[PDB]
Structure 1
Amino acid sequence: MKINRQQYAESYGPTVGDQVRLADTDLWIEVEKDYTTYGDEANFGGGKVLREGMGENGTYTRTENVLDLLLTNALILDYTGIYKADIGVKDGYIVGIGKGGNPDIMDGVTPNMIVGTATEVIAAEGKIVTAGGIDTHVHFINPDQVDVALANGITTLFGGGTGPAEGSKATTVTPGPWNIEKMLKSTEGLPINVGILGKGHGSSIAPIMEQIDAGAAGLKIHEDWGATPASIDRSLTVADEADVQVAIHSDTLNEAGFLEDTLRAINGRVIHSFHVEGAGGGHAPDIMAMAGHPNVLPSSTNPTRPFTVNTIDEHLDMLMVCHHLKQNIPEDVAFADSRIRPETIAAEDILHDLGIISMMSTDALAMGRAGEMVLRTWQTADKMKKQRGPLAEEKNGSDNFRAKRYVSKYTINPAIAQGIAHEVGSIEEGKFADLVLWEPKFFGVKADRVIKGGIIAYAQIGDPSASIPTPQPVMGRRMYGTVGDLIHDTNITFMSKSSIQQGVPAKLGLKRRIGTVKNCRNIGKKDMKWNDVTTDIDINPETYEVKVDGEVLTCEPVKELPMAQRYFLF
């Protein structure tokens, strides 16, 4: 018996060689392999295969290799590959990627992926499944930002803030032991993973270090607090001892140094360069040269992503509003023109495509959009396909190489940079079961279901009063993962080793899973999956032209993007 490949893909999702369009982009992903045994595919429902004595084992207790949860027939899109597999979850972690069911009667069953009495089923046939997004440039300004992030497939927020205080509205900073303690206790109520950054500013060690001991997962150096050689040097000294990451927003004004003075203060130590293109902040005009150095893990914020006809007009005005610039103070006008630059924003698209910028991030509510890191990553890949063509590395007419390079920017690479990739950032065995299901038609635009530690936290679903859940209105809603005490077991507060050793979770009564920040100081650019390129980036101080290998990087702004007016009510 044979099934033609159209009926096969309609029943079980696609298989080896089948391609899938990402939303309404020109980007195609190809199934690279499939863990199934054709005919023994797992599926759940009336008269289906996962039933007692059949594809569901009726013998084994939960401990005897039985799953808490099986996602059937997932099309996985991850830095590790684009492929078809069942995903098994147990104790809130991914324990098996392979072939689920019952070894009683089925060939090819991964030994620890038994569907048993204890197994819940999520049908992923026809869905794309990715890791949860890791947003490492978050301002905690407004709690309503969390659902915005969940709705576009973000599962981890790293940054800082105490709410809509000016310090927090400008900088990813929860300053000092008390604010860090208050925001750790706030975090108990936020249905997403969180890590908090302290203020990376001081000329003595103790005022900085006491933030790491209080529970900070990292530091932020921001020009608004003084991105001086001293604040840079002390923060990195603290980070090398504490094994946490430092994010930098450099001295845009060149007040105490040019870019080379900042790099000298860094002195070859590991650092996360935020909004490396520089519209979001940094050494005017040449900050983006950071992205060529091997000790720099470079990230973009999302409003420059990608370069469009409205980008420059929007940004000149955004900066005027954000900075209270006056169009009748020539210094304010010179400043804006020195900072919002089509030459660098245009080059930023191509650096992303070449794997020279490793990461995306939002800059949520400070200078960036909480729900558009995933959205604008795929808009950039699609624009670069249109302008630059398939990358040389591609084969079979698929965009798998570009898709792995771009999915890495908001999954694995921010996890590696932050020191949290042992827990999150990819669909691999042994990592926390933070999983996003997407309908291909909505891929990168609106997540179907967001799974946090093996329970659904967020879903597009309809009328709660209805016979079935699909009637209108279908909207994003918090699910049982977010209710009562289950919000503690489904989410991770990431903390420094020292705060963990010093008992800060028990001191503060934190009930959330505690994640350990580690292995941040021993990495560089080369550890950025698919995005590992070091090069001499030249930025002309007169023209702002960007050169790599003595070649000018430029492209056109586009009039139209996919994943926009087809999808959005506003």
Structure 2
Amino acid sequence: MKINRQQYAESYGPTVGDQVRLADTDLWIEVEKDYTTYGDEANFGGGKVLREGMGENGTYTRTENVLDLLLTNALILDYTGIYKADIGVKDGYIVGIGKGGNPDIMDGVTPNMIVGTATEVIAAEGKIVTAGGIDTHVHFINPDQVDVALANGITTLFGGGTGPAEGSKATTVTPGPWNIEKMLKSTEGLPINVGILGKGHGSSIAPIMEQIDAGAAGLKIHEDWGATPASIDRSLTVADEADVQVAIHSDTLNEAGFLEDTLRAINGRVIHSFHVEGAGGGHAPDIMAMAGHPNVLPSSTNPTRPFTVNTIDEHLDMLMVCHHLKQNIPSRIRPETIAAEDILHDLGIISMMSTDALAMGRAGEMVLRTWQTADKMKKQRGPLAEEKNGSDNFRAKRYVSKYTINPAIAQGIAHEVGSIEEGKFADLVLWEPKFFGVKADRVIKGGIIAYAQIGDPSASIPTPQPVMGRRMYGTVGDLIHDTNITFMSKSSIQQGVPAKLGLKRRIGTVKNCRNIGKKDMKWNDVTTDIDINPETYEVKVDGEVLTCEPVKELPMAQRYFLF
């Protein structure tokens, strides 16, 4: 007996060779392989397979290889591949990617993916499943920002802030032991993973280091606190000893040095370069040259992403506003660098996306703009050379890496989060293809759903209107502790800061981020000579001129959004 492909895909989701459109873009992903055994697919409901003595094992206790949760028939889009598999979760972690069910009667069942009495089922047939997004440029300014981030598929916020204080409104900084303590305690109430950056500023070691010891997960050097050679040097000395990441927003004014002076202060050490294009801040006009260096982990913030007809006007708008806050604003907003930034993303020269949430970037549009950028580059440059089968798999993997694995690697947290791999924490986002990258269906945090687009709570079923994003049981009562991770420095963990503050959240250790570089950025590992003409702002890559133009319209926009 055979099933034609069309019916197969509409019952179990697509299989090898089938392609799926991402939202309303022209990007197509193709299933590269499938872990299933045809005819033994798992599924759940009346007269279906996951029933006792059939696809559900009736014998084994929870320890006997039995899952807490099976996502059935998921189409995984990840740096590691685009493929079809069941995903098994246990103790809040991904334990198995393969084929789930009952070895009593089914062939090809991954040994630790038994569906037993202890197993919950999520049907992912017809969905795309990705890792949760990792946003490493967050300003903690307004708690309402968390649901905004969840609704667009973000599960980890790294950054700084104490709320709408001017320091926090300008910089991703929680300054000093006491502010850090207060925000670690606040974090207890936020249904998302968090890591907090201290102020990367000082001319002695101790004022800086004491923030790492208090529980910071990294540091932020920002021009508004003095992005001087001294603060750069001291912060990187601290980071090399504490094994945490430093993010930099460099001296736009070129007051104490030009870009070459900042690189000299860095002295070959690892650093994450924020909003590398420079509209968001940094050495005018040439900061973007950072992205060519092997010791630099380069991210974009999202408002320049990608380059559109309104981009400049709105940034000129944004500069007026800065003048009105009277911020030394009589160069800064450059079509040449914003255009080039599109192409650098496509070439794998800028490795990461991030938001810049509420300071100069949009908490809920990291994932959204990543795909708009990929789609614009396909429209303008065409399929990448590396593609085949007519799919966009290569570009899809390069782009998905920018907001999942690469931020995780740069931050020192990729052992926990950032990709759908065995052994990693079960932060997972389900997407209907029609909404992919726009509005997440269900956000799983530590193996429990935390957030979902779901309907009327008084109704006979959950689908009647109004369907909107809502916090689910993972966020309620004490379960918020078990489903979310506070990331902290090794020294604060060793010194017992969690117990000293009463933290009940899972504690993640930041590590292995001093011993990495550009080469470690998955699919985005290009080092090169970037030249930015001081007079014309013309961008060259290894002597070749980079040029693009803005587009009038984007997908993943007015078809979807009520405002």
Instruction: State TM-score, norm by structure 2.
Output: 0.99
Cα distance in structure 2, aligned partners of 1:273 and 1:287: 9
Alpha-carbon distance change, 88 to 328 in structure 1, aligned in 2, over 3 angstroms: closer
Deviations 1:441-489 (A, max 9, x none): 0000000000000000000000000000000000000000000000000
- Shift of residue 328 of structure 1? 12
Q: Is the 8 A contact 2:386 2:394 kept in 1?
A: yes
- Cα deviation for residue 153 of structure 1 reads 0.1
Q: Report the CA distance between 1:551 and its aligned residue.
A: 1.2
- Equivalent residue number for residue 209 of structure 1: 209
Deviation of the 1:326 alpha carbon: 7.1
> What value does the CA root-mean-square deviation take over the aligned residues?
1.0
- Over residues 156-181 of structure 1, what are the superposed CA-to-partner deviations in whole Å (9 max), with x where a residue is unaligned? 00000000000000000000000000
Q: Residues of 1 paired with 2:417 and 2:543: CA distance?
A: 38
SS of 2:188's equivalent?
helix
Determine whether 1:327 maps to 2:327. yes
Q: Does 1:495 align with 2:466?
A: no
8 A Cα contact 2:36 2:99, kept in partner: yes
Question: Aligned equivalents of 2:496 and 2:100: distance in 1?
Answer: 40
In structure 2, the residue matched to 1:143 is: 143
8 Å contact 2:440–2:453 — kept in the other structure?
Answer: yes
CA deviation string 1:108-137 (max 9, x = no partner): 000000000000000000000000000000
Q: Is the 8 A contact 1:319 1:325 kept in 2?
A: no
Aligned-pair distance for 1:46?
0.3
| 1:423-442 equivalent positions in 2, closer than 5 A | 423-442=416-435
What is the CA distance between 1:324 and its match in structure 2? 2.6
Q: What are structure 1's unaligned runs of at least 5 residues? A: 331-337
Instruction: Choose the corresponding residue for 1:522, options 515, 530, 541.
Output: 515
> 2-side partners of 1:327 and 1:316: how far apart?
14
**How many Å separate the matches in 1 of 2:327 and 2:135?**
34
Residues 215 and 10 (structure 1), Cα distance of their counterparts in 2 relative to 1, 3 Å cut: same
Partner deviation per Cα, 1:57-89 (whole Å, 9 max, x = no partner): 000000000000000000000000000000000
CA displacement, residues 364-387 of structure 1 (integer Å, 9 cap, x when unaligned): 000000000000000000000000
Aligned pair count reads: 563
Q: Secondary structure at the match of 1:189?
A: coil
1:246-274 deviation line (CA, Å, top 9, x unaligned): 00000000000000000000000000000
For residues 212-269 of structure 1, give each alpha carbon's deviation from its aligned partner in whole angstroms, at most 9, with x where no partner exists: 0000000000000000000000000000000000000000000000000000000000
CA–CA separation in structure 1 for the residues paired with 2:345 and 2:408: 18
Q: Distance in 2 between matches of 1:406 and 1:320?
A: 32
Question: Alpha-carbon deviation of 1:325?
Answer: 6.6
1:209 Cα offset (Å): 0.0
Superposed CA offset, 1:326-378 (max 9, x none): 79984xxxxxxx11000000000000000000000000000000000000000
Q: Distance in 2 between matches of 1:416 and 1:328?
A: 36
- Alignment correspondent of 2:478: 485
Counterpart for residue 238 of structure 1: 238
Contact 1:494-1:517 at 8 Å conserved across structures: yes
> Is the Cα contact below 8 Å between 2:322 and 2:329 reproduced in 1?
no
Quote how far apart the aligned CAs of 1:549 are. 2.0
Question: Structure 1, residues 15-36: CA drift from partner, whole Å, max 9, x if none?
Answer: 0000000000000000000000
State the TM-score, normalized to the length of structure 1.
0.98
Corresponding residue number in structure 2 for 1:413 = 406
How many Å apart are 1:552 and its aligned residue?
A: 1.0
CA distance in 2 between partners of 1:415 and 1:63 (Å): 30
Write out aligned runs for 1:400-479 (5 A). 400-479=393-472
Distance 2:48 2:460 in 1: 22
**Cα distance, 1:323 vs structure 2:** 4.5
- Describe the SS at the equivalent of 1:283: coil
Runs of at least 5 residues in structure 2 that lack an aligned partner in the other structure: none
Cα distance, 1:307 vs structure 2: 0.2
Secondary structure of the residue that 1:155 maps to in structure 2? strand
| Conserved 8 A contact 1:320-1:326 | no
Residues in 1 aligned to 2:203 and 2:309: alpha-carbon distance in whole angstroms: 44
Which consecutive segments of 4 or more residues in structure 1 shift more than 4 A? 325-330
Does the Cα contact within 8 Å between 2:355 and 2:361 map onto a contact in 1? Answer: yes
Deviation (angstroms), 1:322: 3.2
Equivalent residue number for residue 334 of structure 1 = none
